Amino acid sequence: TVIQPVLQDISVLLQRISPLQIDPTIISNTMSTVSESTTQTLSPASSILG
């Protein structure tokens, strides 16, 4: 309990100072591929997204 605020508060500080932005859609749109229907449902592209 003594440690937890220190680590968490600094983490927020880093987020609200860094120019880096985390945009998950970069992963999403770059897949934009899907296996066909007659074959088994398991597919690697869909599996990783889940």
Place this chain on the structure above:
Amino acid sequence: TVIQPVLQDISVLLQRISPLQIDPTIISNTMSTVSESTTQTLSPASSILG
């Protein structure tokens, strides 16, 4: 899912131009003249049609 609809498009185009016609009754006619005994448990002709 983008290439499979394409393959379908050629299929109908081939169907329009091809003189070949599939008539399944050919198989039935020749199978109807096979000789076998009625006391057998298994019937090869019946099986293949199934």
